[PDB]
Amino acid sequence: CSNFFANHWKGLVVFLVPLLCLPVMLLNEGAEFRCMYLLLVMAIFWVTEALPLYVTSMIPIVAFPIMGIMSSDQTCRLYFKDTLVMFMGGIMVALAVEYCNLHKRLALRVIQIVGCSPRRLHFGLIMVTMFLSMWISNAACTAMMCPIIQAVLEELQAQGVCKINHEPDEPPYPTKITLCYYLGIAYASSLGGCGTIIGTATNLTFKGIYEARFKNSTEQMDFPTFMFYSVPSMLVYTLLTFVFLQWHFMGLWRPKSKEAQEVQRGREGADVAKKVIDQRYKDLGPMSIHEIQVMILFIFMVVMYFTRKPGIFLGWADLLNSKDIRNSMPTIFVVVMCFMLPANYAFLRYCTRRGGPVPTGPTPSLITWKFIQTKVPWGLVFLLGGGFALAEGSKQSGMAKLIGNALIGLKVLPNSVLLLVVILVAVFLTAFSSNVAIANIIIPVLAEMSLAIEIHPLYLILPAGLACSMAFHLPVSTPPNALVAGYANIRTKDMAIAGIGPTIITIITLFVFCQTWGLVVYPNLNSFPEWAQIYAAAA
């Protein structure tokens, strides 16, 4: 009976896939193919959610020492790197913000400014998120923006506009509005990261690779030039992504279905919403010292993030250069300071003697550990560590060299087809792995290939370098996806279906604006310059 398959397919996958993928290991002798087998099995498990994602991420610890790739002590330390500490600290600080009810104040202020229309609110949030992510790391922006979205959704539910969760082990399912807002936040962060060389680590990585490999080159990837080259495309496909998201979930062009909610909100928003929102804001009262301290700490953390080695002026990392200090220091500093500081300052009435009442007990701090344990999604440690460890193991085993030597066979294709195929390959590879690792794998091969067939290296390097960052399908592809999926339970199926669109939008936009607008910034992109001839003759 097919009912058997309908009920117990997950166990069938778990039991059958390794045996079916065994020939990959058995037919080939090198150590590379064992790592390839492991990667294939994990990918198949990730796509179908046969096992919980966190459990699947634990496999490398068992697998690598047996395969002979890395020692057990070396594997376990690849998890819990510096960047992972930064992510977890960001989550903790966001929880601290949520604890003092600051997010409700910000959400009410925003709704009061914009006008209480779900469409306009969505547009404003997307634009603000993109602009912020243009300057800071993506995960920080996503973790910052999650509670604000939560508060806005709660307000809309309170007005009776929409329901956050589907009506009834398994956590509650999210409604289409929730998916729209959260996926919008994540995609906006990922898209806005590409605007500036400070936006994400991938830009710095491939810029450094290009500068090191090619010197004595006329073209420069200077800070203003890169922004001049990248911003217009960013704007165009950000707007197109917003429109697609509105069409998919809110029925923008179709008044047959789902239009009822937005029109119903629009009709009553003119008077009732305006009369109610301001009163609710008044009911909060003046901002208290608790929130002032939390806000000051958050602003300090962001400023410290921005001013560490910005590249356009001296940074505080240049001072204190005895040992390499990275971004985890300010975050943990803030987390500790949250516990150290008090929340009232009402006890000074003893020394001042001006005040009558006394606390009659210890003054609570800014946050409590019981709150942090209950809310933090501790499973993310294994997922992100699995990504890092898998990348490092792929480096050491020798599979990255295998892929690089595999790609060299694309010299036959004409130029435009070659560019399109390169973009597609970059997207497909980055779907399953860290962006930085994919860039390291791909760029040098492209440089050598370009020198082989007499093409200006930038013409191929820049589109691929940008394309490495376009990942929208799976929670493992990029940290913002994982954070959003953890915060509000989002299943993989819905997110892949939703992401099927921005992939096409970004590919087409990147192709067209490259081939057309890149000439304006770099006039000699089509021609093959002299210094390239010198390098080719040398090689």
Next chain:
Amino acid sequence: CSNFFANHWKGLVVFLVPLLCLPVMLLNEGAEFRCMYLLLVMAIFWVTEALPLYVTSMIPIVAFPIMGIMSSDQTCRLYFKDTLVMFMGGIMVALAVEYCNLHKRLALRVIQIVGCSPRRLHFGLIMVTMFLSMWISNAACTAMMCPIIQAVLEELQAQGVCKINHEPDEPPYPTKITLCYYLGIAYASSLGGCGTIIGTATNLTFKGIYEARFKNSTEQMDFPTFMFYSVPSMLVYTLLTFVFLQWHFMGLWRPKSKEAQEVQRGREGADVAKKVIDQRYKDLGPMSIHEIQVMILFIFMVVMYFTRKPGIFLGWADLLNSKDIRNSMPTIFVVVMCFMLPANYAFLRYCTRRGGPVPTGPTPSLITWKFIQTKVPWGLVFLLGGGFALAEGSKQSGMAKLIGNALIGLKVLPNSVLLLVVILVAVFLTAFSSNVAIANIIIPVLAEMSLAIEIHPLYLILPAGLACSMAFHLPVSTPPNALVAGYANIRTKDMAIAGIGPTIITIITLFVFCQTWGLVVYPNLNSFPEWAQIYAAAA
């Protein structure tokens, strides 16, 4: 203003202590003094519990990179080492045991065997824990035995004998009987570790140091001789520790409230308790496939623990020698296998068609991630990683060499006084640091100093090597204490007060049995052998 001190002393300590400890860095020059300042501040925070322990353990991440001792990336990677993964996996497997109600079955079986008297049950549990900890790592035994103690306490409460917790945001306070049981488990593991070379890593460490430093030695610390030397003392002070614990938490020799509570137990539970217990056991059905599978996995895990490179026979770690498997493999393997396997095995009715309704749904696994997230104390990650990070920082900064040089000046004292002072110093230094670390910092100095004066090296090395493992005062001293404090909410003051007994008992017992019984096992211990003279002359 006395009430002000009574209420707000914690924050007063937090504010004042760093300023008062600043002269340590200010007056002295080297980096080791900065490391010493950090260690002193963290110790004072640990003792008074001004901050949560988990928060205090985070300070090294901020402190070390600023002081220039270590880079930021290395410090974070020192956390979450291999051994920490082993501990966390052990906790997860214990939770898996708790999920399927196996612990109740084991507890009822034990109560049937022993006889349902709190005193006799406590004695039996202590002896069993000691015997197991002879052969396995201590943390494994503690994580093994926590749920069993929980189940036994629940049964006794259901009989109306005692109450686990005091009558009510903070977690509940445990009563005296709970403290007695849990502290007994932890102390029993620590004490029983010293019996055998395999028992703990400290024994292996100092045995290896002695063998490497002094070849050509007549006396041998092989497997049987060490056991012959160590077992009798271990039995004596285990028994004395049990007697002290009974005296302190129950009225063993005092007419008190606790004395009445225990003494009344025998009257009502002469035979009614036996009848009720047998009825309750018969109420439970026969073992299901769930419990059988969990038990098989647990036994497999323990066997893999034992058979990895023992001295007496060949181990599986010697095979697969390409990389160090290093014992994390079995634990994570078991954890993953728990999620992979099913629970009912009733779906085979499709193929066999023997009879019975089809499940009409997915079959649940052995455990669920929601259960794991709720129960595991996740702060233990930071609390245990702090020890490794702090130890490595101490090695690199240069503190350890400073302490070793400071220890030389003791050579002026006579022999027995020297032995006593050595034992005291070893205990004091192991209460704020990892046991293995203190051994590496103290043993070579003792070897050289014993060569300098005319003393047999074993006479000093062996008692100190045993003494390094006696830590009973703080949750940070040794992993069993941390696990017990996490599982049942135990404040530091109670543990610190209770730890006075075992410290004195062990110190006196080692002193006396060394000086008396050691000569029987190793004759000519007092005299200076020939090879010692050769080694001393060649210096």
